[PDB]
Amino acid sequence: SSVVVDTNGQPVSNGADAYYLVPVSHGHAGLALAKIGNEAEPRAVVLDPHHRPGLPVRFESPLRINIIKESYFLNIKFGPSSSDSGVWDVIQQDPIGLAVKVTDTKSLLGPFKVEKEGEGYKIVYYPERGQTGLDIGLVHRNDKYYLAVKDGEPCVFKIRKAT
């Protein structure tokens, strides 16, 4: 139910502003796109030490409210609000399990919530809206840390307005 706040204590906007997800551990790393194997284009979301601050995200709810709360189902996307691309989804991928990947479609209510965890926030994935969700963590495979479902081992982030 709480309002999600950024590193300046301000409410996180619904879509209008972009934010960096800054891990609290895993040293300095930022969000990036990578290949999983031999796909042509990098569409897996990873945390990469070489990309700081990383690709910023927008959090989107179809509710008529200009801020985000922990109770809202969210779409999360890279790029501008206007673009169909960059939308996060959870995809079965043999090496990772359930990987966070970008795609170019978006459901009315997205798969995620942002929930307080430790000193920051985690992303939680909901297979079904009436049931408990599954923590998003990191799967280390082929020299990359892939964002993936890893229940009980969440990646904890602070949310920095991109300005």
Curated annotation (Swiss-Prot):
Gene Ontology cellular-component annotations: extracellular region
Temperature dependence: Thermolabile.
Keyword Nucleus: no
Pfam families from the UniProt entry: Kunitz_legume
Alphabetical keyword list: Protease inhibitor, Secreted, Serine protease inhibitor
S-S bridge residues: none
InterPro entries: Kunitz_inhibitor_STI-like_sf (IPR011065), Prot_inh_Kunz-lg (IPR002160)
Recorded GO MF terms: serine-type endopeptidase inhibitor activity
Keyword Secreted listed: yes
Gene3D superfamilies in alphabetical order: 2.80.10.50
Cellular compartment(s): Secreted
Role summary: Inhibits bovine trypsin, human plasma kallikrein and plasmin and weakly bovine chymotrypsin.
Family: Belongs to the protease inhibitor I3 (leguminous Kunitz-type inhibitor) family.
Subunit details: Monomer.
Stated name of the protein: Kunitz-type serine protease inhibitor BbKI
Organism: Bauhinia bauhinioides
